[PDB]
Scaffold this active site. Structure first.
Site, PDB file in Angstrom:
ATOM      1  CD  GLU A 140     -39.948  -5.938  27.952  1.00 14.76           C
ATOM      2  OE1 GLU A 140     -39.005  -5.883  27.583  1.00 14.76           O
ATOM      3  OE2 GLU A 140     -40.672  -6.494  28.968  1.00 14.76           O
ATOM      4  CG  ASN A 194     -35.801  -5.958  22.761  1.00 22.00           C
ATOM      5  OD1 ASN A 194     -34.547  -6.256  22.453  1.00 22.00           O
ATOM      6  ND2 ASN A 194     -35.727  -5.999  23.706  1.00 22.00           N
ATOM      7  CB  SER A 216     -35.701  -3.696  27.384  1.00 16.52           C
ATOM      8  OG  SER A 216     -36.491  -4.144  26.548  1.00 16.52           O
ATOM      9  N   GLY A 217     -33.136  -3.392  24.225  1.00 18.20           N
ATOM     10  CA  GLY A 217     -33.266  -2.281  23.363  1.00 18.20           C
ATOM     11  C   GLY A 217     -32.188  -3.723  22.951  1.00 18.20           C
ATOM     12  CB  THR A 261     -31.574 -14.405  21.839  1.00 22.62           C
ATOM     13  OG1 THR A 261     -32.288 -14.587  22.668  1.00 22.62           O
ATOM     14  CG2 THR A 261     -31.691 -16.318  21.486  1.00 22.62           C
ATOM     15  CB  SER A 267     -38.866  -7.848  23.780  1.00 19.14           C
ATOM     16  OG  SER A 267     -38.150  -7.727  24.468  1.00 19.14           O
ATOM     17  CB  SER A 268     -35.556 -12.999  24.992  1.00 23.86           C
ATOM     18  OG  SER A 268     -34.246 -11.122  25.021  1.00 23.86           O
ATOM     19  N   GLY A 279     -35.487  -8.277  28.858  1.00 22.82           N
ATOM     20  CA  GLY A 279     -36.805  -7.938  28.565  1.00 22.82           C
ATOM     21  C   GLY A 279     -36.651  -7.991  30.203  1.00 22.82           C
TER      22      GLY A 279
END
Lengths: 156, 840, 196, 156, 41
Positions: free
Chosen positions: B463, B235, B175-176, B180, B238-239, B461
């Site tokens: 978090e 992020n 995450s950052g 995609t 974020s996906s 993802g």
């Protein structure tokens, strides 16, 4: 449908010359029903008697003039592609609604109630739908298959 | 040319240095990189060396006695104003850090780190639309093609097409980094390898008319993004979910389609929010972007804080709107061949997941039961479902909780009630999205060309907030398994592939574990969890959850932070699990209620049901997801199995999870290890502290020890012999043969300088630097024979594809030589036809 | 070759068999190398017996033009002149065809080697697909009805009578007369109407 | 090279005679392009457009009488090229140790050198073996069908 | 679906009706037939 269209008259003048083997006109009684079925009107044998037409051999025969009030009564009533008591008429052995009923009670209830037709057609309501080994065969797709139709419109 | 590539698409280098033999005597040593105590690496000077110990000062202002192996000798100009960073062989964090800083300065973003790349991702889009692009990624030099993700995809296509066995390109990250955003540039190589038919008048223009398969492969990523991507502020874009994309390539490299499945999706980013989380990207798109038609029907405001699951505005990252992103995705349905109907029907269900927010503590009675004095609020939900304002406001307030298997209620106050409004939304959004990918996947099963794929795995993802959902936890139990494909490919499958090929390298495997206690089979993973397999019933204890965690996840995992449980009642316990990213304080409660469902199976299931059955197909075929077998019991669904089961789709996702993971295990590695550069997601800003942290957990020492020979260019040795063109001969090959020490002769025959080559008799292997720019100068030097083949191809084309001046003429003249005398020449002295003549 | 030029090298090319008087000059220029002469003339060599038939009568149908005299051995160009203009139907240019189906004066004795020299003749046997075939862009066999077409649209221009006559006189096989039969015309497939 | 000589005039008449089809001795503007190329002056597309040619559909018709006071200028500075050079050149790429050439690969090396191959010509180099497995040429029948021209005239 | 077989029969009925009249017309106007068997000359 729910009302006569101008093209269903233009279709019926053409298909008039089929019914009389000469290429003239005079609608045969079983071919009375084949004209209503190639114009999106598919009554029962008890609805045919209400309109005053025919769908089988040996019943009254008419000319194309005489065919228009008969054809117009089906439009006011059911069976022109309307929904009520088709895939709403099936299932009562299940108090669950999963969109499924029993395989055994989906091929010998059309043969023990109903106007009663062929064992091959009793096998098509079982064939269109999914199969599992839990005894759950759907009823609701074979009807929509009929909505798709050979021709959704006016046959030819 | 002048030995720099020509800018058209943006971020192309304009060099100072050349990565050639000069750079090699620079290496260390005077200045070194010492580790800060505040996170990061900075520059220190050796003030005195006591042998094996050293005293290296820091700009932190400390003086520190350090041990040899820790202090990285300064990286030489090979990573300053060069296309290079493929030649990395330098260890620990710092080596990488300096070089990526200098990559921004060098006008680039992605760079090779050997075979196992590093990607620093802010997201920018270079034009793809030009008839310029569809030559550039139709194969060109290694700096006409930049060291961005297009390069790797060239050398995969070139690899695959020479050796006729399959490759993958497998992206990890935290995450950052938005996985995609990277993948769409892999696809933009593929999608722009295409050329089109000759024009008859000799017209050079054409292409950007071909071809809907390439278009489809792109377009799906916006569709997948609008539902599954939300954002964060660490992020942006974020996906939070997981998708597995198998892209399929042709004979000429042209995309054939993409079999795209979906793993999970969140049910925790729209049931309430944590501070500086935004909900799913699509909501805001739909709101800002909306056309006047949909605006009326769907009953949308472009104002926020009139909800509670939709709060937080725009977050700054380049190249993202909400409004223009609506039009992109709406078109992205159109292109897929999806139904014009099902878009609005799906929007109706989608937009109620905004509307729902701002409802709490509705005990005001209308009918001697918990409902509300609201009207408009719930009417804008109500109409879009069909069900009225009363159906809505009754069923929100408390769930029917299976206790034993019968139905009870709890007392629930304002927050409790709030959270249960959010239930109704998360059940809808998960279930629609899950129908949704799979029916779009059908159409993308046309191939019609060669059956070779690359499989790109995107499960992102993570978090780091006081609360994350149980949904995210099951996602991060995949993330652990991603770090295991790293281990398995960085040691093992990399050098198994080196051995097969017969390329030089001493075959040595070092030990590192980041997990090994997890199994890539279903049955171990589906002893877990008691917050699954017994939660739908009040027999579920948070105690046993942790106990079964500690066997299956902990033993061979190292960055795993143990559960310390608060013994009273129901846990507020914290633990954490290995990943490239930090420690997560978890909240354990509420995981319970979500698989006893705050808003049930049943309540949702009846919006699914229709009244012409067309409605039904859009969400279900009929077993499960809107139609129900009834009874209490079971896990998963929907209403298979069985009834109001209270969903446990996470268990079903053990089963399938085996199926995604194992095939991908056996595929030969191309890798991209996506690192957080900076949080703001912006070119020319990178943080040292973030990258320092991500690389220590991504075992960066080991990760250069094998990849000190990294090759992320792999092509055809004939092809490269031919791009320089060899007209001198004494003993120079023209043969398809080894490049071990032979590559130095087919360069040096006529001009050229040489610094990078490697052995090859099928795939030839290169690293960045010396090749590319010397091959642009062969455009300038090569006159004569080369350019006259090219003029001859013009004379070829034109003669054939005029379409009437081709082979028409020779025939037409002989045709004439009969036509001038057709009456005579169709007989002779003796008429022999008496067999079959119209009157005779 | 300019406008003017391709008028001239009908009369000037004229590479046998094309050295014939024509309808308004003979065949349209073949390109500068003389490969295509072989499609201007093909020649075989099987002799077929005289008086073996009873469609042998045919030689008497031709006779008068090629035998002014009652025991023949007339002048040697008169085969090459008169027979052109209504013998094996109308319109002259049968010069080199006639000089290659008769090896000197034709008469009832000489008939074995003209009946035989039919199969040598011009554009006889040596059957090949590609010749006409490459017109229609190599797609299907190139037959009668596309030749008629071509004569009113493209190519050099020649007397329209001969073509409309030739279609009408077709045997019909159903895809007309393919290139195979345009060569192999001696063995099956001929004409109707007036003459010889 | 070569100056104005009988042999060149024949070369030019021959290419022209292929390039018509109308039987009227008129070729379009664009055909000046490939006529000159076949004559082995080795023009560029610039040299074509200089002579009012086109890489689009024709605009007007040219007789040989126009074409030749262009051409007698074009001949100055040219190389008639050798054959053996293109063979030696294309031997450099191999794929069996026999001078065999994957189609994509042969388009790509031309693209990325020289005046640079267009979208269309790489499709033409590719055309032979299009969209199957890609797709192997051989140097000797490659060069040879190009130079010979595909039916300048044949006796078969 | 079967009415399709019958729909191409609508034009066919018009051909057999003219043909039945010609079954007797050409039997008063004979020397309009003769086809391969053993009787031709």
């Amino acid at each position: 449908m729910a009302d006569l269209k101008a093209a269903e008259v233009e279709k019926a003048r053409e298909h008039f010359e089929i019914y009389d083997w000469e290429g003239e006109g005079k609608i045969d009684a079983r071919d009375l029903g084949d004209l209503l079925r190639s114009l999106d009107c598919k009554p029962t044998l008890a609805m045919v008697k209400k309109n005053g037409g025919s769908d089988k051999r040996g019943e009254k025969k008419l000319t194309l003039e005489e065919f228009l009030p008969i054809f117009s009564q089906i439009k006011k009533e059911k069976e022109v592609g309307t929904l009520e008591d088709f895939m709403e008429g099936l299932k009562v052995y299940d108090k669950a609604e999963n969109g499924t009923m029993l395989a055994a009670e989906l091929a010998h209830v059309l043969l023990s109630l109903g106007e009663r037709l062929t064992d091959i057609e009793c096998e098509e309501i079982m064939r269109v739908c999914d199969e599992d080994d839990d005894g759950f065969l759907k009823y609701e797709p074979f009807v929509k298959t009929i909505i798709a139709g050979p021709f959704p419109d006016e046959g030819k | 040319m002048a030995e720099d590539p020509d800018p058209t698409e943006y971020l192309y280098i304009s060099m100072e240095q050349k990565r050639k033999d000069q750079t090699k005597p620079y290496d260390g040593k005077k200045m070194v990189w010492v580790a800060d105590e505040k996170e990061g690496y900075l520059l220190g000077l050796i003030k005195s060396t006591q042998g094996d110990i050293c005293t290296v000062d820091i700009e932190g202002q400390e003086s520190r006695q350090v041990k040899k192996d820790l202090l990285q000798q300064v990286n030489p100009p090979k990573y300053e104003k060069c296309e290079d960073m493929s030649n990395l062989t330098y260890l620990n964090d710092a080596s990488v850090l300096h070089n990526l800083k200098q990559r921004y300065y060098a006008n680039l973003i992605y760079t090779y780190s050997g075979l196992f790349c590093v990607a620093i991702n802010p997201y920018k889009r270079f034009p793809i639309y030009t008839n310029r692009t569809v030559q550039i990624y139709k194969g060109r030099r290694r700096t006409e093609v930049p060291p961005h993700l297009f390069a790797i995809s060239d050398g995969a296509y070139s690899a695959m097409l020479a050796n006729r066995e399959n490759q993958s390109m497998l992206i990890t990250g935290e995450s950052g980094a938005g996985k995609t955003e990277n993948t769409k540039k892999v696809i933009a190589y593929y999608a722009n390898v295409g050329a089109a038919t000759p024009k008859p008048g000799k017209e050079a223009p054409t292409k950007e008319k071909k071809a809907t398969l390439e278009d489809q492969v792109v377009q799906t990523n916006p569709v997948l993004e609008a539902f599954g991507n939300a954002k964060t502020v660490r992020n942006d874009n974020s996906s939070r979910f997981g998708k597995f994309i198998r892209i399929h390539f042709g004979p000429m490299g042209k995309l054939a389609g993409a079999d795209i499945e979906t793993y999970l999706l969140e049910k925790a980013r729209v049931i309430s929010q944590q501070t500086l989380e935004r909900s799913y990207h699509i909501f805001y798109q739909l709101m800002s972007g909306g056309i006047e038609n949909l605006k009326a029907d769907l009953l949308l405001s472009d104002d926020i804080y009139d909800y509670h699951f939709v709060s937080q505005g725009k977050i700054e990252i380049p190249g993202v709107d909400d409004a223009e992103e609506l039009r992109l995705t709406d078109t992205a349905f159109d292109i897929l061949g999806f139904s014009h109907e099902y878009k609005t029907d799906v929007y109706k269900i989608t937009a109620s997941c905004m509307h729902l927010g701002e409802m709490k503590f509705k005990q005001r009675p209308r009918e001697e039961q918990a409902e509300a004095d609201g009207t408009e609020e719930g009417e804008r939900v109500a109409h879009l479902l069909g069900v009225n304002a009363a159906d809505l406001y009754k069923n929100l307030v408390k769930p029917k909780i299976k206790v034993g298997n019968e139905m009870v209620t709890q007392g629930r106050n304002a927050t409790q009630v709030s959270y249960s409004v959010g239930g109704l939304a998360k059940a809808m959004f998960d279930r629609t999205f899950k129908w949704l990918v799979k029916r779009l996947n059908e159409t993308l099963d046309t191939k019609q060309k060669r059956q070779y794929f690359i499989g790109v795995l995107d499960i992102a993802g993570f978090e780091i907030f006081d609360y994350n959902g149980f949904e995210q936890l099951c996602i991060n139990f995949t993330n652990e398994k991603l770090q295991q494909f790293f281990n398995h490919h960085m040691f093992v499958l990399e050098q198994e592939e080196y051995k097969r090929e017969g390329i030089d390298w001493v075959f040595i495997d070092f030990g590192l574990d980041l997990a090994a206690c997890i199994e890539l089979i279903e049955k171990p993973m589906g002893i877990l969890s008691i917050l699954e397999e017994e939660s739908m019933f009040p027999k579920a204890t948070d105690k046993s959850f942790q106990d079964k965690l500690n066997a299956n996840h902990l033993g061979k995992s190292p960055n795993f932070v143990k559960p310390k449980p608060p013994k009273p009642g129901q846990q507020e316990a914290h633990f954490s699990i290995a990943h490239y990213a930090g420690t997560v304080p978890y909240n354990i409660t509420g995981w319970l209620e979500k698989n006893k469902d705050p808003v049930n199976d049943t309540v949702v299931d009846q919006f699914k049901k229709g009244s012409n059955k067309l409605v039904q197909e859009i969400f279900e075929d009929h077993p499960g997801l809107g139609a129900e077998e009834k009874g209490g019991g079971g896990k998963g669904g929907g209403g298979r199995k069985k009834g109001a089961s209270f969903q446990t789709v996470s268990a079903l996702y053990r089963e399938q999870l085996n199926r995604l993971m194992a095939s991908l295990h056996s595929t030969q590695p191309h890798f991209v290890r996506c690192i957080i550069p900076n949080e703001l997601k912006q070119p020319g800003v990178i943080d040292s502290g973030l990258v320092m942290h991500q690389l220590t957990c991504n075992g960066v020492l080991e990760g250069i020890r094998i990849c000190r020979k990294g090759f992320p260019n792999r092509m055809v040795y004939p092809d490269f012999k031919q791009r320089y063109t060899i007209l001198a001969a004494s003993a120079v090959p023209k043969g398809f043969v080894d490049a071990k020490k032979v590559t130095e002769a087919v360069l040096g025959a006529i001009q050229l300088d040489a610094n990078d080559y490697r052995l090859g008799n099928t795939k030839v292997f290169f690293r960045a630097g010396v090749l590319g720019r010397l091959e642009e100068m062969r455009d300038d030097r090569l006159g004569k024979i080369v350019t006259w083949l090219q003029a001859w191809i013009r004379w070829y084309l034109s003669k054939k594809e005029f379409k009437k001046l081709q082979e028409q003429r020779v025939a037409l003249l002989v045709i004439q030589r009969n036509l001038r005398k057709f009456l005579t020449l169709r007989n002779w002295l003796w008429y022999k036809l008496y067999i079959k003549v119209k009157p005779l | 070759m300019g406008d003017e030029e391709k008028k001239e090298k009908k009369k000037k090319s004229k590479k046998k068999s094309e050295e014939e008087g024509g309808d308004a000059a003979p065949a349209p220029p073949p390109p500068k190398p003389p490969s295509q002469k072989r499609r201007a003339q093909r020649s075989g060599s099987n002799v077929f017996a005289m008086f073996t038939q009873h469609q042998v009568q045919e030689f008497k149908e031709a006779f008068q033009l090629i035998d002014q005299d009652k025991d023949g051995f007339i002048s040697k160009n008169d085969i090459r002149a008169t027979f052109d203009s209504l013998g094996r139907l109308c319109t002259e240019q049968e010069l080199d065809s006639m000089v290659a189906e008769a090896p000197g004066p034709i008469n009832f004795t000489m008939f074995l080697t003209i009946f035989g020299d039919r199969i040598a003749g011009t554009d006889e046997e040596d059957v090949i697909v590609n010749a006409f075939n490459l017109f229609d862009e190599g797609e299907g066999k190139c037959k009668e009805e596309t030749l008629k077409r071509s004569l009113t649209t493209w190519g050099e221009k020649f007397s329209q009578d001969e073509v409309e006559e030739a279609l009408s006189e077709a045997p019909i096989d159903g895809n007309g007369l393919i290139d195979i039969k345009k060569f192999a015309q001696i063995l099956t497939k001929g004409a109707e109407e007036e003459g010889a």
